[PDB]
Amino acid sequence: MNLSSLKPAEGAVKSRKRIGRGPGSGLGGTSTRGHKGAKSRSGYSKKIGFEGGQMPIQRRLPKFGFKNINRVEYKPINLSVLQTLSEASVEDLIAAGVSRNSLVKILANGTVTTALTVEAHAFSKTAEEAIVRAGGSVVKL
Amino acid sequence: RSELSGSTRKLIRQKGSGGARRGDINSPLLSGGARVFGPRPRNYSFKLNKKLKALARRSALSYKAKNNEIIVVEDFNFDAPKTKAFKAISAALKVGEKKVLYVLPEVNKNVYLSARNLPNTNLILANLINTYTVLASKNLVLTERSVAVVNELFKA
Amino acid sequence: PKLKTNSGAKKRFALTGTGKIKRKHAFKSHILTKKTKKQKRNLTYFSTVHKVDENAVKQLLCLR
Amino acid sequence: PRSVNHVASRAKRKRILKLTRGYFGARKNVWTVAKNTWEKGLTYAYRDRKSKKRNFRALWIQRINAAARLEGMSYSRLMGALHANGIEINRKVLADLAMNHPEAFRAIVAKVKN
RNA sequence: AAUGGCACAAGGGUGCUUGACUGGGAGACAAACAAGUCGCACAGGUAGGAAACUAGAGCAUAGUGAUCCGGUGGUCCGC
RNA sequence: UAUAUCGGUAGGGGAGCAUUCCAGCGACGUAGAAGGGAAAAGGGCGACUUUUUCUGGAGUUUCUGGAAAAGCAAA
RNA sequence: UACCGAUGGAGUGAGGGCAUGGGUGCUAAGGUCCAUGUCCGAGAGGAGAAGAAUCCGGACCACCGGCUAAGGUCCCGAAA
RNA sequence: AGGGUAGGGGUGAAAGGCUAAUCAACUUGGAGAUAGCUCGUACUCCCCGAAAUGCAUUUAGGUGCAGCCUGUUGGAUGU
RNA sequence: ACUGGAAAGUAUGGCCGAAGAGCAUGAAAGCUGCGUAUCCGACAUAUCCCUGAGUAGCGCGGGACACGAAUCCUGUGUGAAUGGCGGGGCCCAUCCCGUAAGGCUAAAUACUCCCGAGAGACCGAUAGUGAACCAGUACCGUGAGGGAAAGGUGAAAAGAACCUCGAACAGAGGAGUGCAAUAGACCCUGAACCCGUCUGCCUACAAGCGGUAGGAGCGCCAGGUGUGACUGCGUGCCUUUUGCAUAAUGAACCUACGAGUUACUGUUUGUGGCAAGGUUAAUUGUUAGACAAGGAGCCGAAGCGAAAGCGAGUCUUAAAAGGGCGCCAGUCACGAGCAGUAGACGCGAAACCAAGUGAUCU
RNA sequence: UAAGGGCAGACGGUGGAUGCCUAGGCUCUCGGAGGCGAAGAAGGACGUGAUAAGCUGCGAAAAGCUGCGGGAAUCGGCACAUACGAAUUGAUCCGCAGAUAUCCGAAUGGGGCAACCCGUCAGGCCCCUGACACAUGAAUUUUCAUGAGCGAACGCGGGGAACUGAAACAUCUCAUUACCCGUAGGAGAAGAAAACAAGUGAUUCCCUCAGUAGUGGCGAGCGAACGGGGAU
Ligand SMILES: [K+]
Ligand SMILES: [K+]
Ligand SMILES: [K+]
Ligand SMILES: [K+]
Ligand SMILES: [K+]
Ligand SMILES: [K+]
Ligand SMILES: [K+]
Ligand SMILES: [K+]
Ligand SMILES: [K+]
Ligand SMILES: [K+]
Ligand SMILES: [Mg+2]
Ligand SMILES: [Mg+2]
Ligand SMILES: [Mg+2]
Ligand SMILES: [Mg+2]
Ligand SMILES: [Mg+2]
Ligand SMILES: [Mg+2]
Ligand SMILES: [Mg+2]
Ligand SMILES: [Mg+2]
Ligand SMILES: [Mg+2]
Ligand SMILES: [Mg+2]
Ligand SMILES: [Mg+2]
Ligand SMILES: [Mg+2]
Ligand SMILES: [Mg+2]
Ligand SMILES: [Mg+2]
Ligand SMILES: [Mg+2]
Ligand SMILES: [Mg+2]
Ligand SMILES: [Mg+2]
Ligand SMILES: [Mg+2]
Ligand SMILES: [Mg+2]
Ligand SMILES: [Mg+2]
Ligand SMILES: [Mg+2]
Ligand SMILES: [Mg+2]
Ligand SMILES: [Mg+2]
Ligand SMILES: [Mg+2]
Ligand SMILES: [Mg+2]
Ligand SMILES: [Mg+2]
Ligand SMILES: [Mg+2]
Ligand SMILES: [Mg+2]
Ligand SMILES: [Mg+2]
Ligand SMILES: [Mg+2]
Ligand SMILES: [Mg+2]
Ligand SMILES: [Mg+2]
Ligand SMILES: [Mg+2]
Ligand SMILES: [Mg+2]
Ligand SMILES: [Mg+2]
Ligand SMILES: [Mg+2]
Ligand SMILES: [Mg+2]
Ligand SMILES: [Mg+2]
Ligand SMILES: [Mg+2]
Ligand SMILES: [Mg+2]
Ligand SMILES: [Mg+2]
Ligand SMILES: [Mg+2]
Ligand SMILES: [Mg+2]
Ligand SMILES: [Mg+2]
Ligand SMILES: [Mg+2]
Ligand SMILES: [Mg+2]
Ligand SMILES: [Mg+2]
Ligand code: NA
Ligand code: NA
Ligand code: NA
Ligand code: NA
Ligand code: NA
Ligand code: NA
């Protein structure tokens, strides 16, 4: 193709819907709005959380809990991806190839099965036991 | 309606006059009234992914190569601007009938001045190649340095 | 303009792992000697928003 | 850009108004009146295409009745006899023979006169 | 209140008692939602009883009302 | 290829026509453009489209894609 | 032959007549309130003189072909 | 003849009279106030096709959620 | 050379090009004119020991801060310290940070009555400014104020000498000009409604939405076209309704005008690019919108718990899977649907408030 | 027999649709510039041409006067005009610099119903005319300098609604908006820690943080900052 025979992919562009333009289109007259009432008028809008005057669910239910400000949340990294990164080293904690100046916690879902010394901010007890069983070490710093 | 110059006074009293009820003179129903849902100033730019743009560029170049409109020529310079010399170059390359696009490695002011007045000729730098410009011309002419630049800068 | 979250909804609802809405049962604040122990424990437990009330709770939470 | 389809909008009306020639008074040329008249006529035409078949069958039956009474029978007796004998000539052909080929109608009647 | 149930009584007495329990809710009924109803298993420690067994209040169905803000008792987080 | 199906208001879905402008590719025009009158023909169907002639006396248009001040019978 | 899950878009939330079972009313109302069907609503065609829902019958388009329904066959008006 | 009293303000031998043919003022602006109300809503062909019920509501000619329609999908079950 | 009233058109054959932008010219011009690319050019006149007291702080009443009673401000009443003093969301202690009650300060930012040069998938005379022209004019009002309609002969006025009818150009018929006067001053084109004349057919015994389906005769020009004796069927349309020929609503008619649009943010979906990753924003560089940079940020990648926290587990428990929630391909765009915020499909109140104009009527 | 009528075609009338056309609008970009005025403004009144002036220009020197530079044959403005003149001893025109510049208007000698009436003191004419001066207020020591009024938006400051939303409404919202008033500049404001934070290092603006923390008849709603990336 050139500029003279351009063609979009099949089904990529669709024509817009145009209402209030006659009977044959199926969208004229009342123009998809029904007959009367509030919803038929220009400028009608739905009040969010309004149910006709019945007490809404967001007022019927109670508030609960609180959110801690200084919440230390770790990014989880598992043994399976540790072994995947190991199989193209034996000294992890690079982890940029991920995170971006974050705190990392090593978790035990797969298996290490290698001899690695892993440096991370946190480990689980199962993860520590797994890496030491496979013959590794932890640097919790 | 809010930008017309008439006043907001009720033209006729609400009841009793025997005609249609009327508000102010800026109504779209009245001759000289408001334009409803007319044009507003707009910005038509949108985003395409960089990799999508690169793919489109390479597709245009591949299409030119497959359809055999790419001619590689030697680099040339002009001591003084001269339209006749560029016309002769186009005639010798057999590109002077339809639209042609020459791709140059650098500015080459004398060459640009020479090609300025020719009607079916376009010039472009190698590093500024885009899909529209590549596709808009029947013939593509490259120099050796332009080929090197395009290969280095638009690969994969 | 960007959509604004409803403050009451953001104080009353929470998202679960598989995109469900977590909520607290509401009949247990101040008349509890009369009620039944099993009733009170079932109101203590954390419930989920009904499917018909979903997308309304989502509109309140800005479809999040 | 600004788009006003002046020529197409007028041409639609002119095409329809060529169809309302011959109407009475304002119904031929006044457009809202003329367009109103033309659509009601179209509903009539749909109905009358159906009614034309009944009208022509009734005319055939009346002509066959007269010719059969000339021959000595009635329509119902003649048609019963034809159906019993298995003659498949329809009422249009029978009416045409009765009006224009009385000898052929007579031979048909004589075939089932037994 | 009315209706349904009730002789092995669910009706009436005696003795001992506090199961008018703690951790609970396989599974159902009912239902716009909110609400509502019946009901486990097993563990801990008891009451009655020779034991088996029963006891998570009352023959059952009315006896109330959300959220927000406050009060009291117990036990994780902000400066 | 068969069978089945094809009345419809509110309403949902699908596929198209015309209009103004733009890009690319083609074209037409004082040996007569657009517009206006008359006539003829066409379309699974239709929105609409071609052709002939008179008036007219200078601009118009095909296809593919793009964008809308994108269609009136009642207020 | 299209019943459920999940999702996108709705409209409707003034109903009415007939038959059947009832309440109300006066065993009145083209009355009113429920229930079960049905039709009009949103349904053209045929008979009943002319009638929203009574009787027959669900219209893709064309036909100057044929058979039937309800109901009819002395004339207006098809057929004894 | 000249002058003074200015908007719910003036003036009223009091009628809610009069205040430039306007009175339980006029002009311009906020302003396209708001109107759960009435009216109106324009090209074409094809496929499908309702409801006028329940619950709640300062609710009853409005609206929310069910019920009933439609598009696209995955399951077997619907009559 | 051809057509033409007139070539810039078409067909040949040439030339210029740092100039093939444009406008004008009797039709559409790189080479007819003004210009354009490029280069040159100004007599002037302009522009470039001390350390801030009615303070810090405090009571009462208020205000501004995102905040509807910490920091900041103060009407009223009070009132220190000089290593000391202030803040870190109310108060205390430690710690940390700072040094009030004095002042000045460019840039990056906001705007367009005005001047110069440019542009538009903006309008094209009921549009676009109210205003293309006599426009804030005419007109209306005591006043404040409100507020129109109105463009086009022809290339060139060559804008019709003279004749005829007529009192007269009132108007016309000629002649003449001109490509054209049915371009003759209201002048390009010249539609509808509405109004006439001529020709063809029908019509004075006939009764309802005016059509529709049949069907002679007559009349025109070779199977077309006009009319329509006579026959069957037929209570307009819109809207609102359980239901409208309805004696419910609405329209004199025609032409023109007139009503789901756009922005942002979500969500679903069609189609795409990359893919365990996906994507840049503001902005910057080069040449002049394009190309390249820019990873801040956002989403995904692990959940459970109010939370500390633990983690394919976790919460509840003294403990038990006894129960709950979880384990057992995304992301960025383009097109479309829908939602919210904006006047948000259009027209329509009675009113409310602010600032002005009116006692020439009464 | 058509008094009249109906339908069709042709040809006219009216009217001004449509098509084509337009420098008249609309939205912007870039670069400048961002005032005018007591040396009298903006905006007006009356005049001014050979011939009445509707616009334009100009001001009793009145479609114009002078000089320098540019240029070289027509010019004497426009509303479909002629006459009569100017001009190669260089008109007209163009750039720059000058001259004149009535009356009103802040209006300023006093008044006043704008474009008018009436004056005083000195000076030059002869009841009456032409050139001066003669306002106020804050500075200055009578002299001197400034100010006043008008005007686009943007800035700062003083006052400050309501309709509306909350499906009623009073806290709240609309909104520290409309509007009134005062006052700068080419920009203004802010700005150099008695700061943020739990290491940074003055202001201002942009992208994020984030519809997050908070706030709220905890309703409708409102809504940061730290940090990070930039402009500077
Ligand atoms: K309609
Ligand atoms: K209530
Ligand atoms: K055109
Ligand atoms: K009913
Ligand atoms: K209630
Ligand atoms: K002409
Ligand atoms: K012309
Ligand atoms: K005409
Ligand atoms: K008829
Ligand atoms: K009436
Ligand atoms: Mg429909
Ligand atoms: Mg509705
Ligand atoms: Mg309606
Ligand atoms: Mg209704
Ligand atoms: Mg409205
Ligand atoms: Mg107003
Ligand atoms: Mg307009
Ligand atoms: Mg539109
Ligand atoms: Mg039949
Ligand atoms: Mg059918
Ligand atoms: Mg259908
Ligand atoms: Mg012709
Ligand atoms: Mg339109
Ligand atoms: Mg129209
Ligand atoms: Mg209702
Ligand atoms: Mg009802
Ligand atoms: Mg009834
Ligand atoms: Mg209805
Ligand atoms: Mg039906
Ligand atoms: Mg039969
Ligand atoms: Mg008969
Ligand atoms: Mg009274
Ligand atoms: Mg009066
Ligand atoms: Mg407002
Ligand atoms: Mg209004
Ligand atoms: Mg409303
Ligand atoms: Mg169907
Ligand atoms: Mg609903
Ligand atoms: Mg030229
Ligand atoms: Mg106009
Ligand atoms: Mg006369
Ligand atoms: Mg003509
Ligand atoms: Mg004409
Ligand atoms: Mg008779
Ligand atoms: Mg007769
Ligand atoms: Mg009624
Ligand atoms: Mg009827
Ligand atoms: Mg009405
Ligand atoms: Mg009427
Ligand atoms: Mg009517
Ligand atoms: Mg009408
Ligand atoms: Mg009309
Ligand atoms: Mg006649
Ligand atoms: Mg005519
Ligand atoms: Mg003088
Ligand atoms: Mg004075
Ligand atoms: Mg309210
Ligand atoms: Na559709
Ligand atoms: Na021409
Ligand atoms: Na004449
Ligand atoms: Na009328
Ligand atoms: Na006649
Ligand atoms: Na004076």
Contact list in B for residue A1 (CB cut-off 8 A) is 63
Distance of CA D33 to the CA centre of its chain: 28
For residue D30, give every residue at least 6 positions away whose Cβ sits within 8 Å of its Cβ, in sequence order, or none.
Answer: none
For residue A129, give every residue at least 6 positions away whose Cβ sits within 8 Å of its Cβ, in sequence order, or none.
Answer: A108
Give long-range contacts, CB 8 A cutoff, 24+ apart: B115-119: B115/B83, B115/B86, B116/B83, B117/B83, B118/B83, B118/B86, B118/B87, B118/B90
Q: How many CA atoms lie within 13 A of D80 on its CB side?
A: 6
Q: Look up residue A124 and give its two tokens.
A: 């689980």
DSSP A109: S
On whether the CB atoms of residues D98 and D73 are closer than 8 A, the answer is no
Q: Is the dihedral of CA A94, A98, A100, A101 positive or negative?
A: negative
Touching chains A and C? (3+ Cβ pairs < 8 A)? yes
> Pairing mode, if any, of strands A137-140 and B121-125?
unpaired
Q: Is there a contact between A3 and B63 if contact means CB atoms under 8 Å apart? A: no
> E strands within chain A?
75-78, 104-107, 117-120, 122-123, 137-140
**Cα A77 from Cα A106, distance rounded (Å):** 5
The number of residues in chain D equals: 114
Q: Look up residue A18 and give its two tokens.
A: 């145009």
Q: Does B98 touch chain A (CB under 8 A)?
A: no
Contact list in B for residue A3 (CB cut-off 8 A) is 132, 135-136
Q: How many H helices and E strands in chain A? A: 3, 5
- Give me the resolution in angstroms, 1 decimal: 2.7
Residues linked to residue A138 through DSSP beta bridges, in sequence order? A118
**Cα C57 from Cα C61, distance rounded (Å):** 6
**Cα B123 from Cα A76, distance rounded (Å):** 55
**Cα A89 from Cα A83, distance rounded (Å):** 9
Contact list in C for residue A64 (CB cut-off 8 A) is 12, 24
On whether the CB atoms of residues B133 and B102 are closer than 8 A, the answer is no
Whole-angstrom CA distances from D75 to D20, D72, D110 are: 44, 10, 14
Q: Å from D22 (CA) to I202 (C1')?
A: 13
Q: Does A3 touch chain B (CB under 8 A)?
A: yes
Distance of CA D30 to the CA centre of its chain: 31
For residue B142, give every residue at least 6 positions away whose Cβ sits within 8 Å of its Cβ, in sequence order, or none.
Answer: B70, B71, B72, B73, B103, B150
Of A48, A57, A59, the CB nearest to C53: A57
> Pairing mode, if any, of strands B121-125 and C21-24?
unpaired
**Cα B102 from Cα B124, distance rounded (Å):** 6
Q: Is the dihedral of CA A78, A84, A85, A90 positive or negative?
A: positive
On whether the CB atoms of residues B150 and B126 are closer than 8 A, the answer is yes
Q: How many CA atoms lie within 13 A of C18 on its CB side?
A: 1
**Cα B107 from Cα D31, distance rounded (Å):** 68
Closest CA to C47 of C16, C18, C17: C16
**Cα B69 from Cα B100, distance rounded (Å):** 10
Q: Does A6 touch chain B (CB under 8 A)?
A: no
The helix or strand, by DSSP H or E, that contains position B70, with its residue range, turns out to be strand B70-73
The number of residues in chain C equals: 64
On whether the CB atoms of residues B120 and B139 are closer than 8 A, the answer is no
Instruction: Work out the burial of residue C25: count CB atoms within 10 Å of its CB; fewer than 13 is exposed, 13-18 middle, 19 or more buried.
Output: middle
On whether the CB atoms of residues B54 and B154 are closer than 8 A, the answer is yes
First to last CA, chain B: 55
Return the residue in C3, C10, C12, C49 with the most chain A beta carbons within 10 A, the one to mutate for interface testing: C12
Rg (C-alpha) for chain C, rounded Å, is: 14
**Cα D4 from Cα B93, distance rounded (Å):** 49
**Cα C10 from Cα C12, distance rounded (Å):** 6
Q: What is the 3-state secondary structure (H, E, C) of B86-130?
A: HHHHHHHHCCCCCCEEEEECCCCHHHHHHHHCCCCEEEEEHHHCC
Return the residue in C11, C21, C29 with the most chain A beta carbons within 10 A, the one to mutate for interface testing: C11
**Cα A80 from Cα A103, distance rounded (Å):** 19
**Cα A134 from Cα B52, distance rounded (Å):** 45
- With contact defined as 3+ CB pairs under 8 Å, the chains touching A are B, C
For residue A94, give every residue at least 6 positions away whose Cβ sits within 8 Å of its Cβ, in sequence order, or none.
Answer: A85
Q: How many H helices and E strands in chain B? A: 5, 4
On whether the CB atoms of residues A130 and A108 are closer than 8 A, the answer is yes
Phi, psi of A31, deg, nearest 5: 60, 55
Within 10 Å of residue C12's Cβ, how many Cβ atoms?
25
On whether the CB atoms of residues B86 and B115 are closer than 8 A, the answer is yes
Closest CA to D92 of D68, D66, D56, D65: D56
Cα angle for residues A62, A67, A68 (degrees, 5° grid): 150
Residues linked to residue C21 through DSSP beta bridges, in sequence order? C15
**Cα B23 from Cα B36, distance rounded (Å):** 16
Q: Cα distance from C27 to chain A (closest Cα, Å)?
A: 8
Question: Whose structure tokens read 């790419």?
Answer: B70
Distance of CA A97 to the CA centre of its chain: 21
Closest residue (CA to C1') to nucleotide I240 in the complex: A35
Q: Cα distance from A5 to chain B (closest Cα, Å)?
A: 11
Q: Å from A2 (CA) to J116 (C1')?
A: 84
Question: Whose structure tokens read 């109608």?
Answer: D105
Strand I–CB A98 distance below 7 A: yes
Q: How many CA atoms lie within 13 A of A17 on its CB side?
A: 6
Q: Look up residue B22 and give its two tokens.
A: 């009327």
Q: Look up residue B138 and give its two tokens.
A: 């029947």
